[PDB]
Design an enzyme around this catalytic site. Structure first.
Site, PDB file in Angstrom:
ATOM      1  N   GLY A 157     -45.537  34.878  -2.094  1.00 32.18           N
ATOM      2  CA  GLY A 157     -44.353  35.635  -2.447  1.00 32.18           C
ATOM      3  C   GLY A 157     -43.169  35.423  -1.529  1.00 32.18           C
TER       4      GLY A 157
ATOM      5  N   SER B  20     -49.756  31.068   0.055  1.00 27.70           N
ATOM      6  CA  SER B  20     -48.753  30.777   1.079  1.00 27.70           C
ATOM      7  C   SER B  20     -48.645  31.835   2.162  1.00 27.70           C
ATOM      8  CB  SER B  20     -47.380  30.614   0.413  1.00 27.70           C
ATOM      9  OG  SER B  20     -46.885  31.862  -0.038  1.00 27.70           O
ATOM     10  N   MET B  21     -48.457  33.095   1.774  1.00 30.18           N
ATOM     11  CA  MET B  21     -48.351  34.196   2.718  1.00 30.18           C
ATOM     12  C   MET B  21     -49.694  34.824   3.028  1.00 30.18           C
ATOM     13  SD  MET B  21     -45.689  35.096   4.481  1.00 30.18           S
ATOM     14  CE  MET B  21     -44.898  33.872   3.446  1.00 30.18           C
TER      15      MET B  21
ATOM     16  N   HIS C 149     -49.096  25.778   2.016  1.00 27.34           N
ATOM     17  CA  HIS C 149     -48.036  24.874   1.593  1.00 27.34           C
ATOM     18  C   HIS C 149     -46.727  25.340   2.218  1.00 27.34           C
ATOM     19  CE1 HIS C 149     -48.160  27.776  -1.923  1.00 27.34           C
ATOM     20  NE2 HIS C 149     -46.881  27.846  -1.599  1.00 27.34           N
TER      21      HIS C 149
ATOM     22  N   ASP D 136     -50.064  20.675  -1.263  1.00 27.77           N
ATOM     23  CA  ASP D 136     -51.049  21.738  -1.407  1.00 27.77           C
ATOM     24  C   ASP D 136     -52.411  21.249  -0.935  1.00 27.77           C
ATOM     25  OD1 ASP D 136     -49.069  23.352  -2.545  1.00 27.77           O
ATOM     26  OD2 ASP D 136     -49.521  22.638  -4.569  1.00 27.77           O
TER      27      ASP D 136
END
Ligand SMILES: Nc1ncnc2c1ncn2[C@@H]1O[C@H](COP(=O)(O)OP(=O)(O)O)[C@@H](O)[C@H]1O
Ligand SMILES: [Mg+2]
Lengths: 340, 191, 191, 191
Positions: free
Chosen positions: D67, D96-97, D121, D170
């Site tokens: 996000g 990601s987070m 990523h 990725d």
């Protein structure tokens, strides 16, 4: 015997510093109360009803002192019974009867002394609004207006119980009604929030300066007290907050002033206790923030005196101990003239 | 989400919303575009506070970009109809329908913040129909325009002709300019 | 969903939402785009806390990408009007309007986390109409731009010319950079 | 629908939702895309638990496909600032987070279920405008990419050159692979 209200005021003023409004009220109140016990002649004038007082002041204002000090001027049995302990019948807790019981223990079980006694029920505000509320108030109502005693015998059957009528005794009531300032604020200029509002000055001992001056029965009813209960007590005394200006005038002016008492003990060893004007003011501020007021002076002072009070006796030739504003706070130590 | 607060009264602890807690202190909030539904809530609040104490003043914060003329008129007429003085404190912005309520407050009780902006312009209207209908509606909106100008002239005290010229086009006025114009009486800076 | 919380006070147990519980500690949260509806809540919250304790400081967390200039001005003007010190602790991001509120905090009480981005940009405005309206609406967006530059120069202490130069284009400033600029007082890392 | 739960404490019975009941045990849930509103709830929960017990550990379950970077940083910075050790347990996905918040837990307190999948990523961004504006935003997204890589290196111990190489595209890592990489410490299989 029946001292003039002015004389009572001056005697009470010796210790109390700035309670003139209540001083006069309390003075006249007792003055007429004892005149009734005195005016017992049969001339169609026994009907006189007693008028109980309702002292409202922030904690530590001096309520108790006035009650205690005045008790000495009367030289008769006096007592202070907390209101929290009392609970309606049918559940564990002190019974309303107990108030009379303890009151009579100070009287020595003398009916004449009992009728000429004064009560100082405290923390009345606590019992506001099924149990511990209206119930206690309802029970107390009869007691304060008219009731016969049932105090069991001391030491040593059930008929042994003694009786006395609670229609002479002046039942003074002292209470720190937290939140009453907001109720009185609703009377006029209700605005608490907003740009053009009456937002409280601060959260220190300045808030209630004269906020109780405009106290009416309606507010007390809104507070939670039963309407009948408020009616029972027609007189409503008001006390100040004992702010920094008061605390400065209370540390040396009173006959029992801590400085005087401390000086007496110091004078015995030969040390001339001295205090600086700013020094005394410093203690006042420290007590106000601590929220201990009157009761914080002794402790605060003991933390600044006791230290050198354990040394001074072992030291000889000591002539003076200058207490500086710095000494009051935790920066310096009491200046002392070790030699002459 | 609207936060909840506790009164902690002598009677007992009660939970009030942030808006209701302020409403107890005679404070009404006017936020967003003006419409019949929100305006009626302000009317209901004013009427309720009236019965509690007709002598005490009622505060009314106004931060709105305008809206329905009829909805605003109900608030203005209600403020004058009730007995207590309705103070006004403009926060944020004040558009034509917004500034007609701010100027409708009791004399000496109209305020605004330092960076507040007040705008006044002609009433906006729209309609579709025959020529006869257009002529009828055109007279109505024109008549309404005269009433709004008279209202501002009464409170501000400026001449009616001056109000019409200024309202002909959008005119932004700051706190200082509004005081001289007569829309308000004092610009609050600090407590 | 907002989780509930119990204070477990001596008087008794009451259920408070996660936001309401922190409000009792004189804490206000500003999340999302700035608008009239959300900004009005902050106003009511700031004023409400003033009555409970007008001496205790207030902590206003700012994480917002900007929004209405008028709505933000009501918050800034309110923070300065009230007596309590309004601390600011920027978490996440602080765009043009968010940065103004972060800079409006009391002296020495402005903070920001290490991975916090503080951006400054000119006010955004949009209007359509005749040339006369455009000229009228252009002075307002230009006059507002001057007020915001003066506010930053007052708190940050930098000269007005530097503020105008920096506000011309987007300028991202980290925690350390913002301290030199005067936007904040200290960068907190660990308790 | 969220079910209700009864604690049945010694003082008396209380009713809490399934999420609030777990919050009492210092457990926080991170579900769905990371955004300012949901992220603010986590921050509030972390601070509230800190006051209740600043010594007891906290468990943060992370199930999110990523996000907003700013929202995530507010959580990461908060976890490190507070005194209690915020554990982390992957319950199936962190793109990601989620991995930045899974690898930002106290040493020895980062777990992952047997069949969880973790990815890493570079931060994706979107912006349009003039060439000058693009160059300014390009530097910002390049600065963030470096700060994020530094965080992983610190907690994982791997050199920055490896992190940058692995974040270009990725890269999926299983529970066992993540332990060797340094993202986590232990893989919970059974009680
Ligand atoms: N003006 C004063 N002078 C001397 N002592 C005071 C004064 N005011 C309060 N005190 C002290 O404060 C104590 C507390 O009593 P009081 O203030 O009457 O109500 P409370 O006991 O509820 O605090 C008393 O023991 C008294 O010695
Ligand atoms: Mg006492």
């Amino acid at each position: 015997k029946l001292p003039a209200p002015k004389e009572i005021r001056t005697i009470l003023d010796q210790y109390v510093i700035g309670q003139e409004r209540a001083k006069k009220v309390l003075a006249v109140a007792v003055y007429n109360h004892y005149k009734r016990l005195n005016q017992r002649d049969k001339k169609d004038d026994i009907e006189l009803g007693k008028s109980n007082i309702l002292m409202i002041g922030p904690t530590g204002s001096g309520k108790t002192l006035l009650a205690e000090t005045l008790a000495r001027l009367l030289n008769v049995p006096f007592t202070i019974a907390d209101a929290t302990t009392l609970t309606e019948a049918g559940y564990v807790g002190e019974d309303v009867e107990n108030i009379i019981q303890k009151l009579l223990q100070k009287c020595d079980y003398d009916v004449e002394k009992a009728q000429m006694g004064i009560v100082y029920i405290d923390e009345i505000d606590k019992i506001s609004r099924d149990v511990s509320g209206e119930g206690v108030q309802q029970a107390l109502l009869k007691l304060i207006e008219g009731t016969v005693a049932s105090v069991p015998p001391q030491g040593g059957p059930q008929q042994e119980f003694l009786q006395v009528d609670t229609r002479n005794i002046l039942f003074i009531c002292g209470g720190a009604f937290a939140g009453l300032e907001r109720v009185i604020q609703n009377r006029s200029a209700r605005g608490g929030i907003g740009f053009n509002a009456e937002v409280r000055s601060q959260e220190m001992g300045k808030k209630v300066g004269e906020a109780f001056k405009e106290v009416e029965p309606e507010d007390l009813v809104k507070f939670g007290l039963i309407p009948e209960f408020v009616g029972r007590l027609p007189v409503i005394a008001t006390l100040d907050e004992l702010d920094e200006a008061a605390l400065m005038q209370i540390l040396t002016e009173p006959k029992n002033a801590l400085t005087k008492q401390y000086a007496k003990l110091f004078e015995m060893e030969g040390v001339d206790l001295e205090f600086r004007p700013d020094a005394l003011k410093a203690v006042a501020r420290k007590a106000l923030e601590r929220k201990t007021g009157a009761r914080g002076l002794r402790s605060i002072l003991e933390g600044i005196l006791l230290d050198t009070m354990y040394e001074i006796p072992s030291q000889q030739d000591v002539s003076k101990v200058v207490i500086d504003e710095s000494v009051i706070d935790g920066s310096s130590q009491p200046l002392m003239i070790y030699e002459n | 989400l609207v936060p909840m607060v506790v009164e902690q009264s002598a009677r007992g602890e009660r939970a009030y919303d942030i808006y209701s807690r302020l409403l107890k202190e005679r404070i009404i909030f006017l936020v967003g575009q003006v419409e019949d539904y929100m305006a009626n809530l302000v009317v209901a609040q004013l009427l309720f506070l009236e019965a509690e104490n007709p002598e005490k003043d009622i505060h009314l914060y106004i931060n709105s970009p305008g809206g329905s003329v009829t909805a605003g008129m109900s608030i203005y007429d209600t403020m004058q109809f009730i007995k207590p003085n309705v103070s006004t404190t403009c926060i944020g912005q004040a558009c034509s329908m917004g500034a007609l309520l701010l100027a409708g407050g009791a004399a000496g009780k109209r305020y605004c913040l330092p960076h507040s902006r007040m705008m006044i312009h002609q009433p906006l209207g729209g309609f579709q129909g025959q020529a006869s209908d257009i002529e009828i509606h055109a007279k109505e909106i024109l008549f309404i325009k005269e009433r709004l100008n008279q209202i501002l002239a009464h409170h501000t005290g400026q001449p009616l002709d001056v109000i019409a010229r200024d309202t002909d086009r959008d005119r932004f006025m700051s706190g200082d300019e509004a005081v001289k114009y007569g829309l308000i009486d004092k610009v609050m800076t600090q407590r």
